[PDB]
Amino acid sequence: KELVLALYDYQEKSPREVTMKKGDILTLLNSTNKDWWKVEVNDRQGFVPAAYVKKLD
Fold this sequence. Notes:
Layout: E1 2-6, E2 25-30, E3 36-41, E4 44-49, E5 53-55
Antiparallel strand pairs: 1-2, 1-5, 2-3, 3-4
């Protein structure tokens, strides 16, 4: 799939969100929304702000 790099820590603030640490390599599940992307962080899935991750090309 697609991988993204976490640019900052992000602590989930809502049920559909997930937490990540700066430096994390996340599997990107859905990037159809411009503000919130669905990612896999270890054994969890949910939304983090699109601005806080960077697609790995």
